[PDB]
Design an enzyme around this catalytic site. Structure first.
Site, mmCIF file in Angstrom:
data_model
loop_
_atom_site.group_PDB
_atom_site.id
_atom_site.type_symbol
_atom_site.label_atom_id
_atom_site.label_comp_id
_atom_site.label_asym_id
_atom_site.label_seq_id
_atom_site.Cartn_x
_atom_site.Cartn_y
_atom_site.Cartn_z
ATOM 1 C CG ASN A 1 -6.607 0.231 -0.367
ATOM 2 O OD1 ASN A 1 -5.738 0.363 -1.225
ATOM 3 N ND2 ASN A 1 -6.317 0.047 0.913
ATOM 4 C CB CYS B 1 -1.035 -0.007 1.113
ATOM 5 S SG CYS B 1 -2.460 -1.032 0.781
ATOM 6 C CG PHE C 1 -7.063 -4.842 -0.473
ATOM 7 C CD1 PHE C 1 -6.759 -5.846 0.463
ATOM 8 C CD2 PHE C 1 -6.464 -3.572 -0.324
ATOM 9 C CE1 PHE C 1 -5.869 -5.596 1.546
ATOM 10 C CE2 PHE C 1 -5.571 -3.304 0.753
ATOM 11 C CZ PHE C 1 -5.274 -4.318 1.689
ATOM 12 C CG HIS D 1 -2.675 4.301 0.275
ATOM 13 N ND1 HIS D 1 -3.028 3.887 -0.991
ATOM 14 C CD2 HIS D 1 -2.902 3.247 1.094
ATOM 15 C CE1 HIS D 1 -3.463 2.641 -0.936
ATOM 16 N NE2 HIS D 1 -3.399 2.230 0.317
#
Lengths: 395, 405
Positions: B352, B177, B228, B319
């Site tokens: 994400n 990540c 994810f 992020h």
């Protein structure tokens, strides 16, 4: 906060002045010695394949012409008995290989790093960048993190993890280090190449005959270098300047050398003809690296010093023949192949170390066998060639 | 422009090492000049994800574990995600939809050619926006945590794009990540140290490498499955922009990577015979937030700039590792609720997407800024920071300076 016109002033102050220079080299290898003369006997016994007599004399013949005298491994015959799945052919073994390689590779790498930093002589606090390289094991957080942790480096060291770049990776690390050192004033880059071949160890078979070339070739080892621009006079010892670094892919040759990480670990595949592909295209890569910096290529390749990746005896023989080199030109590479085998990314670091040590011992003009210009070459999957143009400095 | 053919930048006639270095290096700061994005076709809405996931993984009988996952999905602030698979595709692989049956080989067979393919789609869009020939790309930085092979993903992407045989490739494998920040760090030094260099950055992820069934002993795997998504982002970065041809947007001024001590067991992933195993201990949003300000102070002081008294003076590309990371970093830096809007919009529409997330946010920011007629690409502001967070715990801090519209 500064204006739009101040951004260039920040850039001017941030960049280094000179060329990235190798100022220290340290090497390490595991303790278990495996002589090549007895390798066929030891390997076939450890893999419980003694009943395959006709496949044994075939492997013994390959081992006898490798021009490798010994190799070092992190395992002995007793260690292998604890992992029967690694010594088999196709039984699930990645988990066990990862359990050994994930902590083992940065541990071996750290040993080489310690020697490089000790030779360099400056505090470890001055290391600003870490480039770690390996084709043996992958994890999150990566091998670079583990190495930095074991060495006890600063929390803000910029790390680079070069995973699965194979036999050309020893050239790749120089390419990375060049840009990191040159674009950052005061930057000192620690380069670490470490490999544990147990990630690819398995039993022989009739369907995988090209696996026999890999088991007779690869050995464990680690090499570490300290690279930086603007060497401090009287403190640091500048040896090789990294002038030009280029990576090249040879077209339509993907099927030649390829490796896959499966449930059975690393599966090695080599087709008949890799030394020919590498040798036929090496001269074009050399002309390209010289032309990129405006230097006219020498009429005689014997005018340069050489650090070729010892991918095998055949690769060295064919590159030597194509470039019309005298036998003594590849001396350093031949000695490393004999004493240590093919240690993957670590091999070129070992050769560069051998070259500067012998040059200092003979009292030659420069670290590069008394010669001014030379080339470090990496060869591997792709087919990929890493061409690193070096300028050696006086003693 | 770079001035590759100009006399002041010409190579020396004699083999002068310092003269070669002066000619070889670039003059200015690495600048983002194009951003392209891509995602696979299969849409998976978050409001029905608990139903779809528990059915696809033969776990609909675990009623109390389903009501627990439905509560996690409702609190994610993700509206939809994209995947390279549908429910029909998953039925061909019962081993991937199980918890611990051997599945790495099947995941590798999908991810090894799939990740470079998805990355190439984003790269084609970035190259089209840039407008210059693809033969002029000198460096390729490929990034992924999904799949490993020899020759690597960078090789495959270069081949699919038809890049020059002499392109200098960089393969960033398994950096998780924080990798979207790492690529900016690589691109900075590559573009700035090489005159004429044009770096193509490609971040691509296929989360099928980590997909598996829920378990009672691995409760933290549920956080990863609800978070994810698949996606790709590509950027063209180079120093000394050519006026009238290239469109300079963000200058990459300072790039530093930091490890937070004694936090190795907080975020960790292992590649096993069962694929990628995700582990997350409690406390990651708070640990990241308590160390982020020190990372920002470091990046500003490293370039001689006094850190701003108010963090609201900067634009932000954090992020989106989860809504909790965003909420707590926002709170610690005393930021106004809209500072992370671009990040929250991407988290809502795409989830994400690992290393690709920040590229998508940077794209969202510059597009919204241009659409509103703002002063700069960075929300009308001059200075800003791109942040990556992941395994270690590692923080990638990228200081950016936005150029005017």
């Amino acid at each position: 906060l500064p204006l739009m016109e101040d951004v260039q002033g920040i850039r001017k102050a941030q960049k280094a002045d000179g060329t990235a220079t190798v100022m220290a080299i340290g090497t390490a290898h595991p303790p278990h010695i495996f002589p090549q003369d007895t390798y066929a006997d030891v390997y076939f016994r450890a893999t419980n394949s003694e009943h395959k007599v006709e496949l044994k004399k075939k492997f013994d013949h390959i081992c006898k012409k490798t021009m490798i005298g010994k190799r070092y491994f992190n395992y002995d015959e007793e260690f292998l008995k604890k992992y029967p799945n690694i010594t088999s052919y196709d039984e699930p073994s990645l988990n066990d290989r990862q359990d050994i390689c994930v902590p083992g590779v940065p541990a071996l790498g750290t040993e080489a790093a310690v020697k490089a930093i000790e030779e360099w002589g400056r505090p470890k606090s001055e290391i600003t960048h870490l480039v770690f390289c390996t084709s043996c094991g992958v994890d999150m957080p990566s091998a670079d993190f583990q190495c930095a942790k074991l060495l006890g480096l600063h929390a803000n060291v910029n790390k680079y993890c070069i995973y699965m770049q194979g036999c050309y990776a020893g050239g790749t690390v120089m390419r990375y280090a060049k840009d990191l050192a040159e674009n950052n004033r005061g930057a000192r880059v620690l380069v670490v190449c470490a490999e544990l071949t147990i990630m690819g160890l398995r039993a022989p078979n009739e369907t995988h005959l090209d696996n026999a070339i890999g088991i007779s070739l690869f050995g464990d080892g680690a090499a570490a270098l300290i690279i930086g621009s603007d060497p401090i006079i009287g403190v640091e010892k500048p040896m090789f300047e990294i002038v030009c670094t280029k990576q090249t892919v040879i077209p339509n040759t993907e099927d030649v050398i390829h490796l896959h990480l499966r449930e059975t670990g690393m599966m090695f595949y080599l087709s008949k003809g890799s030394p020919m592909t590498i040798s036929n295209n090496v001269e074009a890569c050399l002309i390209d690296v010289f032309k990129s910096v405006g230097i006219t290529p020498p009429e005689d390749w014997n005018s340069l010093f050489w650090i070729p990746h010892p991918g095998g005896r055949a690769i060295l023989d064919q590159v030597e023949a194509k470039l019309k080199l005298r036998p003594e030109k590849f001396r350093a590479a031949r000695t490393v192949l004999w004493d240590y085998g093919n240690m993957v990314s670590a091999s070129v670091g070992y050769i560069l170390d051998e070259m500067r040590r012998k040059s200092a011992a003979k009292g030659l003009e420069t670290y590069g066998e008394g010669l001014e210009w030379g080339v470090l070459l990496g060869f591997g999957p792709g087919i990929t060639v890493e061409t690193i143009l070096l300028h050696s400095l006086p003693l």
